[PDB]
Design a protein around this motif. Structure first.
Motif, PDB file in Angstrom:
ATOM      1  N   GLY A 108      33.456  47.321  35.922  1.00  0.00           N
ATOM      2  CA  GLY A 108      34.776  46.028  35.944  1.00  0.00           C
ATOM      3  C   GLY A 108      36.115  47.132  35.113  1.00  0.00           C
ATOM      4  N   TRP A 131      37.051  50.181  35.801  1.00  0.00           N
ATOM      5  CA  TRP A 131      38.059  50.828  36.171  1.00  0.00           C
ATOM      6  C   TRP A 131      38.249  49.929  37.935  1.00  0.00           C
ATOM      7  CZ3 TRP A 131      40.390  55.276  34.795  1.00  0.00           C
ATOM      8  CH2 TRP A 131      40.523  55.825  34.305  1.00  0.00           C
ATOM      9  N   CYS A 132      39.021  50.579  38.568  1.00  0.00           N
ATOM     10  CA  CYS A 132      39.407  50.237  39.953  1.00  0.00           C
ATOM     11  C   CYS A 132      40.445  51.046  40.788  1.00  0.00           C
ATOM     12  CB  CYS A 132      40.859  49.041  39.321  1.00  0.00           C
ATOM     13  SG  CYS A 132      42.031  47.993  40.416  1.00  0.00           S
ATOM     14  N   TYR A 156      36.389  47.153  42.485  1.00  0.00           N
ATOM     15  CA  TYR A 156      35.867  48.212  41.075  1.00  0.00           C
ATOM     16  C   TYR A 156      34.830  48.519  40.446  1.00  0.00           C
ATOM     17  CZ  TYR A 156      39.760  44.068  39.686  1.00  0.00           C
ATOM     18  OH  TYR A 156      40.742  43.891  39.155  1.00  0.00           O
ATOM     19  N   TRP A 178      41.337  55.768  41.257  1.00  0.00           N
ATOM     20  CA  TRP A 178      41.022  54.945  40.074  1.00  0.00           C
ATOM     21  C   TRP A 178      41.968  55.237  39.286  1.00  0.00           C
ATOM     22  CZ3 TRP A 178      37.595  57.368  44.069  1.00  0.00           C
ATOM     23  CH2 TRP A 178      36.832  56.335  44.062  1.00  0.00           C
ATOM     24  N   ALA A 194      42.738  52.303  43.950  1.00  0.00           N
ATOM     25  CA  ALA A 194      44.128  51.140  44.544  1.00  0.00           C
ATOM     26  C   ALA A 194      44.277  52.300  44.868  1.00  0.00           C
ATOM     27  CB  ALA A 194      44.560  51.041  43.132  1.00  0.00           C
ATOM     28  N   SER A 218      41.513  49.112  35.360  1.00  0.00           N
ATOM     29  CA  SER A 218      41.588  47.982  35.052  1.00  0.00           C
ATOM     30  C   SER A 218      42.384  47.173  34.373  1.00  0.00           C
ATOM     31  CB  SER A 218      40.425  46.815  35.018  1.00  0.00           C
ATOM     32  OG  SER A 218      39.482  47.723  36.368  1.00  0.00           O
ATOM     33  N   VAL A 255      44.292  46.802  45.088  1.00  0.00           N
ATOM     34  CA  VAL A 255      43.465  47.296  45.047  1.00  0.00           C
ATOM     35  C   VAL A 255      42.090  47.138  46.142  1.00  0.00           C
ATOM     36  CG1 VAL A 255      41.675  46.355  43.045  1.00  0.00           C
ATOM     37  CG2 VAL A 255      44.346  46.304  42.780  1.00  0.00           C
TER      38      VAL A 255
END
Length: 57
Positions: A35, A37-38, A31, A48, A40, A51, A28
């Motif tokens: 927060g 979507w993450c 964000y 993305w 990675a 999350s 990861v």
């Protein structure tokens, strides 16, 4: 390695998001502002994911 793991399958639409398969491990990177979507990195690429579809190992 402070990795995350995918809880559910996610398939991307467009080129910003990243497809992941349940059980896949992820680095990861960050964000988004709320927060939701993450960003990675996996062995398959970078992008993305939601999350709520991943968790720390």
């Amino acid at each position: 390695m402070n990795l995350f793991v995918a809880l559910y399958d996610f398939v991307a639409s467009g080129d910003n998001t990243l497809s992941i398969t349940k059980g896949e491990k992820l680095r990861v990177l960050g964000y988004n502002h709320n927060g939701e979507w993450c960003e990675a990195q996996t062995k398959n690429g970078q992008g993305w994911v939601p999350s709520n579809y991943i968790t720390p190992v």
